[PDB]
Each structure stands twice: as C-alpha cells, then as structure tokens.
Amino acid sequence: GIDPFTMFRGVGTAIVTPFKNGELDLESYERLVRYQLENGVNALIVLGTTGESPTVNEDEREKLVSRTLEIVDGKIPVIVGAGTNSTEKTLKLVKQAEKLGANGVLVVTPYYNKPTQEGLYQHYKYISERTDLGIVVYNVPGRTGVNVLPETAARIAADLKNVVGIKEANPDIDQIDRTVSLTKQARSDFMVWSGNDDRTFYLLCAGGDGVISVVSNVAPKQMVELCAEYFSGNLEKSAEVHAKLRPLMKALFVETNPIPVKAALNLMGFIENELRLPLVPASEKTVELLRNVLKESGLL
C-alpha cells in the first residue's frame, strides 16, 4: 500500500522539537506549527535531524506526532523521521508512526555502519514490504558516512512502489543532477526534494520538486515564494528570492543544525533556546550573526 498525500511539491518544513525544563514544549510547538500552516508550507517533517530525533524518547515521539496530526488536521501531509542504522529497529519506528496515523516516513540511509549499495537497497526493500506509508529516502553523506548512488536511488524508485521520493542532501551538483535525472527516468512521478536550503534553486533547475527545509522554520513564506516563483515560470524572481535569503541560509549552518535555528527561533520569541546533549546552545557570535541577518531580512 501507499499514502499519495505524501507526494507534495514545494516546501516541507523540518520542524524543530521545542524543549522546556527538559521536557517537550508543546505549547511553543503548536505556535510553530500554526506559523508554518499560515505561511503556505506544503508538508511538515517531524523528528528529522532538525527535530533532534536522536534525543527524543519513544513516549515523546508519540506525543509529538499525535499533537502534530491534531493541529494539522489533514491540511498537509505529516511525514515522520523514523530511521536508524538497524533495519530491524527502523521497521519498528516506521510501524509506530503508521499506527499513529502519519502520512509518511523520512528514512535516513543507515549512519555510522556504512552499508554497501546493495545493503541500502535491501534496507529500504525490507521496510517497503512491511508498511503502507509513503517512504522518503534521506541521503546526507556529510552526517552518515554513506552516499546513495543515483543509480541505487533509481533502482529503489523502480522497484519499491512505496518509496515516493528522496530528500537529497548531498550538496554536490553532479549528484543532484543525476539523482533527479535517473530516478525520474525510472519512475516519472518519483519526487526529489532538496535537503539543502541553499541548493533548492538549482535542484528546481535540475527538474526537482522542492525542499525539505530548515530555513522555513523562521522564514516559511519566503522559502514558499522561492519555490512558487520557480513553478510559475518566473525564474528571475525565484533567483532574487534565493539571493535575498542567502545570508540567512548560511547563518543557520555556522554551527551544526539545529543549534543556530533554535537560537533564531528563540530570538523571534517562539521557543526556549534549549537543546539536548550532545547539542548545546549557540555561541554568542552565532546569536549576534542571526540577530543581524534576521533584522536585515525583516524577521526581527
């Protein structure tokens, strides 16, 4: 089976997970979700890297996913980060998300253990055969130590009907170009979304479908506009939007994400600037950089 509502185009926000006094801060979370919804965002990715999946426990995951679904109420698909480096454990998280009523799962290539390409394929196949959710492959070699080859992504697209697309966070334009080209040749409706905000414009140019975004946490309307202008055939306006957002795109990565984005959302009054070890709050220099860029972007 499969859930086609996961086949979104445009911006899917990899939303942070707000904490306060060491627990989930769902009141702040709800404000953030509504901020996304009110600003034209087309999907919500919960418990991705940006949402600190490594440090959110099982009971917290269920609470956060359920609350998200309640707020969203079917307006846009809700896609849940649910991948580890164990194929068995990954299936368990996928099934928990399915049980909760999620539309889809975002499933990272196993990190740290560096599986072969055939291993990656078998990993997704095992999951694909045991769920009715739409599955999004998540490639981010900088974090995981492994890169899904475009040919491997294409084989997945052809064989695993459950897998609806891929979040491509390898910043190499050769990879972006070939991932878009090969997967869509294998299956014409396979989606390819940028996993890098600053690659979005070029991934659209390559023939892709949008972005699963960090920037949209703080600037959803602008990221939406970037994509919307492109799809409208207004390449020049899309590029101008991309240009305008550049300072913010870079500033959100001067330290490991989500450290800067949480500092920025705290500056804007949405959340407490609290993360879980081994992550720690942004440096004073990062915070000063964000303050200036946000003010210059009219967000503060």
126 is catalytic: no
Q: Tell me the two tokens of residue 90.
A: 């990954």
Cβ 98 to a copy of itself shortest distance, Å: 19
Identity of the residue, 38 or 189, whose beta carbon is nearer to a copy of itself in the bound complex: 189
Q: Which of 3, 25, 52, 197 binds a copy of itself (CB under 8 A)?
A: 52
DSSP for 137-170?
EEE-HHHHS----HHHHHHHHHH-TTEEEEEE--
292 binds a copy of itself (CB under 8 A): no
Answer for which of 31, 95, 171, 291 binds a copy of itself (CB under 8 A) is: 171
The one catalytic residue among 29, 121, 138, 230: 138
State which of positions 66-95 bind a copy of itself (CB under 8 A).
84-89
Which of 112, 232, 285, 295 binds a copy of itself (CB under 8 A)? It is: 112
The reply to whether 152 sits near a copy of itself by the rule CB under 8 A is: no
The one among 2, 37, 268, 279 contacting a copy of itself by CB under 8 A: 279
Q: Is 116 in the site for a copy of itself (CB under 8 A)?
A: yes
- The answer to whether 267 and 284 have CB atoms below 8 angstroms apart is no
We find the least distance from the C-beta atom of residue 243 to a copy of itself, in angstroms, to be: 5
Site of tokens 């990879």: 175
Which one among 158, 159, 202, 291 touches a copy of itself, defined by CB under 8 A? 202
Nearer CB in complex with a copy of itself: 41/94? 94
Q: Please report, as residue ranges, which positions from 238 to 267 form the binding site for a copy of itself (by CB under 8 A).
A: 239, 243, 246, 255-256, 259
138 is a catalytic site residue = yes
Residue closer to a copy of itself (CB basis): 41 or 289:
289
Known binding-site positions for pyruvate: 50, 212
**Residues that bind a copy of itself in the complex, under the rule CB under 8 A:** 49, 52, 54-55, 84-89, 108, 110-116, 118-120, 122-123, 126, 142-145, 171-174, 176-178, 181, 198-199, 201-202, 205-207, 233, 235-236, 239, 243, 246, 255-256, 259, 276-280
